[PDB]
Design a binder for this molecule. Structure first.
Ligand code: NA
Ligand code: NA
Ligand code: NA
Ligand code: NA
Ligand SMILES: [Zn+2]
Length: 866
């Protein structure tokens, strides 16, 4: 498989303006007829190359004349000797039942449905399967009426008929030109939740949400979220929906989370179905997030699309920013910000330090499905948020407005987006662009000095981005660096210089730079990189007391949490070294004191309290070290949890009981009390054993919702309490016929601290509720083991590596996309010790050797083994 390069982009030799598809649907053999109106822009001797994969070509016509001047190559149909304008007709055959990779047209349970991003449309017919070719689609679908009563595609339903032999047909017309990655088709039998939304402007939009028969009771929260999404995009961005129907379909078998197909979103059902006894607060808020995300794509993705796949972040970074703003506006801004930063530092930093490291705009791709990443998405969003930080909200919106004005109806580039923001705002983003072309995490170093003679405070800030496997050259970035300075009573000291105030977002543009501030009437405590103003690692020599000060006094809740993280980091690193030398936890008293203070602070927002009392994950902790000792990390996390549970036992139990709520609401104040409560429970599970087993058992049984029942079940697993096995059997017994609920249980099983966890996970491959045919199940069991049980995945004997190789040997042939997702923990070998590398290297070489090795895996394996 050969790599493609962004610098090689060039405009297509042909365009397609309109395509009329007829599908004669059957799960064994589907016949596709595709009539495309085409135009040659290039030279007469340039043939038309149509992408296609796994199609059985039946016929080729040009202006109705059967065509003799064409050849099939690997992945293409190359057609010669064409006129300047003409009607291409292709008839071909495909086979949804065979399609286990879940790419193109395929079978989800009894339904048929599509996935065309990034390059799945070429698995349905021969086409210009590149997102700078935009066309007007009409889609005619013919099928068995009993099997497939509902026949859906993008746009509006314009025609319909009955046929002989119990068949019927429906036709759809989507008036907006689109690249083919945005095509969808769905056939099957569903319950439908129908409702409507009226835009600011008076357009009445039919909303229709399709779910498997029996599941209508778990649809209204999605429906409600869609309406909140539409309303918010109006209020915040001035954007209204542009069609008359908005369809969403929930399918069980889906590689991604969900898909923004124009007017017909297809969703993994984990991001639609909720009921208080099946779904946690996290689930409700994730459904809100993803619904919004796909809805926001209607403009930042669909009405403006990507010129080529190297511009993926132009829609995803931006659309992620939008979902984060949505979720933040409607909920707790601070809790969303905190969580998003945990994700950035805890997972994405890891990716930017891996052999898969890339810029948010990649320069080289082998399999474009490997580039739907933490970097492109999350770091992408942080890049958008930096622009926002530099422009302020008003100029940002002006920029948005210019972007649409210039590019509505076409495919654009990341550079285009940046130029609109610059032009609209008059802020120079030349240097800022480097964020799009450079990979890796910059490290910002801050040294400071107070001068009491002159009442001045000097920050000396420097930056470097270490080399990455992909890029030997790095240069300084335009890094927006937000500060606040606190006096000894916790009041903010006005930033100023030479009698004029200074903006608190510093422009750190050079390798090294000094900032001087006047009228600093007291030696300040700084808050640095406020609200994570740039996606960088901060290096500053805090005292413990500067940090607890900030936890007490900082104006922004994020800063208070962030300070706690820095306080902990220090002692997480201490104790990992202590573990390695056979020593127990050490923790100064004043650290535990700081967390007592949080627990008992009467005025603190419980949303914040809960995050501060949520210890960094094992993945977050791992970014504190160049070489990860996954066993030491896991053990220290536990031991820190044990130590705090004992120091703070009385406090924890009190706060636990005080936040009891008899009523369940999906409401932001209730969620926060409940999140704090369950944080308290977690520590208590690691306390006196009998009281632990009682509290946890009790909650499991008394819970009137899944948030509380799972918090308890999860504590029972994590602390290994006597009630564990019995509680896990109750859950299995009650929930085994429900896959999305069981995923929760598989995740617990996979992430268990128990010594025989791998043996359990292997057996669970035969569990009644598991199946290798479903991505959600694969990920909940196998992926969670590999990815979220590092202590066991990295058992010193190599059993984890071997397990994953076995599973990947399957998935490489069955579903390469899920395979590539699952390989990721193996690609990180250079962060582990030599003996572990050698085993992981060997595992990777074994995979490299597989017969039909997928391009999805090849790209990652070869990068890892360089
Ligand atoms: Na076109
Ligand atoms: Na808010
Ligand atoms: Na200093
Ligand atoms: Na990590
Ligand atoms: Zn997206």
């Amino acid at each position: 498989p050969q790599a493609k390069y962004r610098h090689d982009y060039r405009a297509p030799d042909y365009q397609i303006t309109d395509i009329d598809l007829t599908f004669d649907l059957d799960a064994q053999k589907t016949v596709v007829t595709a009539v495309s109106q085409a135009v040659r822009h290039g030279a007469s001797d340039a043939p038309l190359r149509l992408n296609g994969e796994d199609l059985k070509l039946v016929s080729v016509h040009i202006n109705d004349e059967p065509w003799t001047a064409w050849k099939e190559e690997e992945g293409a149909l190359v057609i010669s000797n064409l006129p300047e304008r003409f009607t291409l007709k292709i008839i071909n055959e495909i086979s949804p039942a065979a399609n286990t990779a879940l790419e193109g047209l395929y079978q989800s349970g009894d339904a048929l449905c599509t996935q065309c991003e990034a390059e799945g449309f070429r698995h349905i017919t021969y086409y210009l399967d590149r997102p700078d070719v935009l066309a007007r689609f009409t889609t005619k679908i013919i099928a068995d009426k009993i099997k497939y009563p509902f026949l859906l595609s993008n746009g509006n339903r314009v025609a319909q008929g009955e046929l002989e032999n119990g068949r019927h047909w429906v036709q759809w017309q989507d008036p907006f030109p689109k690249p083919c990655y945005l095509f969808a088709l769905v056939a099957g039998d569903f319950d439908v939740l129908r409702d409507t939304f009226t835009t600011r402007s008076g357009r009445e939009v039919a909303l229709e949400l399709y779910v498997d028969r029996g599941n209508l009771d778990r649809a209204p929260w999605a429906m409600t979220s869609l309406k909140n999404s539409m309303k918010w995009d109006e209020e915040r961005f001035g954007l209204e929906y542009d069609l008359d129907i908005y369809m969403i379909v929930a399918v069980d078998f889906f590689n991604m989370g969900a898909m923004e197909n124009k007017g017909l979103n297809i969703f993994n059902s984990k991001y639609v179905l909720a009921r208080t006894d099946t779904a946690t607060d996290k689930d409700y808020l994730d459904i809100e997030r993803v619904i919004g995300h796909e809805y926001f794509h209607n403009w930042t993705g669909n009405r403006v699309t990507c010129r080529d796949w190297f511009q993926l972040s132009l829609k995803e970074g931006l659309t992620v920013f939008r979902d984060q703003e949505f979720s933040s506006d409607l909920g707790s801004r601070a809790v969303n910000r905190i969580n998003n930063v945990r994700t950035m530092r805890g997972l994405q930093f890891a990716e930017d330090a891996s052999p898969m490291a890339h810029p948010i705009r990649p320069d080289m791709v082998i399999e474009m499905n490997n580039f739907y990443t933490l970097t492109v998405y999350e770091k992408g969003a942080e890049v958008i948020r930096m622009i926002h930080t530099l422009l302020g909200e008003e100029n940002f919106q002006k920029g948005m407005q210019l972007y649409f004005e210039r590019h509505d109806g076409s495919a654009a580039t990341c550079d285009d987006f940046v130029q609109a923001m610059e032009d609209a705002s008059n802020v120079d983003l030349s240097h800022f662009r480097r964020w799009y072309s450079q990979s890796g995490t910059p490290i910002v170093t801050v040294k400071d000095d107070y001068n009491p003679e002159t009442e001045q405070y000097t920050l000396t800030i420097s930056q470097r981005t270490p080399a990455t496997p992909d890029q030997a050259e790095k240069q300084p970035l335009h890094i927006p660096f937000a500060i606040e300075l606190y006096d000894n009573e916790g009041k903010v000291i006005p930033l100023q210089k030479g009698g004029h105030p200074v903006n608190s977002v510093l422009n750190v543009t050079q390798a090294e730079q000094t900032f001087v501030f006047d009228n600093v009437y007291f030696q300040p405590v700084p808050a640095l990189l406020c609200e994570f103003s740039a996606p960088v690692k901060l290096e500053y020599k805090w005292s413990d007391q500067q940090l607890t000060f900030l936890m007490r006094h900082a104006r922004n809740d994020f800063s208070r949490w962030d300070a706690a993280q820095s306080l902990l980091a220090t002692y997480i690193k201490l104790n990992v070294a202590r573990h390695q030398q056979g020593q127990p936890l050490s923790l100064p008293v004043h650290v535990a004191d700081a967390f007592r203070a949080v627990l008992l602070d009467e005025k603190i927002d419980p949303a914040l309290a809960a995050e501060i009392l949520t210890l960094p994950s094992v993945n977050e902790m791992a970014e504190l070290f160049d070489i990860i000792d996954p066993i030491a990390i896991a053990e220290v996390r536990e031991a820190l949890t044990r130590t705090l549970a004992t120091e703070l036992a009385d406090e924890l139990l009190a706060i636990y009981n005080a936040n009891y709520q008899s009523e369940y609401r999906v409401e932001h104040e209730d969620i926060a009390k409940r999140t704090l409560r369950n944080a308290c429970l977690r520590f208590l599970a690691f306390g006196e054993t009998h009281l632990a087993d009682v509290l946890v058992s009790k909650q499991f049984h008394e819970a009137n919702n899944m948030t509380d029942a799972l918090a308890a079940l999860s504590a029972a697993v994590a602390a290994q309490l006597p009630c564990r096995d019995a509680l896990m059997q109750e859950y299995d017994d009650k929930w085994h016929q429900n896959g999305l609920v069981m995923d929760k249980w598989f995740i617990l099983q996979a992430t268990s601290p128990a010594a025989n966890v791998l043996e359990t996970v292997r057996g669970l491959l035969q569990h009644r509720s598991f199946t290798m045919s479903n991505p959600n199940r694969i990920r909940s069991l196998i992926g969670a083991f590999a990815g979220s049980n590092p202590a066991a995945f990295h058992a010193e004997d190599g059993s984890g590596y071997l397990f994953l190789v076995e599973m990947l040997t399957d998935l490489n042939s069955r579903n390469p996309q899920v395979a590539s997702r699952l390989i990721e923990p193996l690609i990180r070998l250079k962060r582990y010790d030599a003996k572990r590398q050698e085993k992981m290297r060997a595992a990777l070489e074994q995979l490299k050797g597989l017969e039909n090795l997928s391009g999805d895996l090849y790209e990652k394996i070869t990068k890892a083994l360089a």
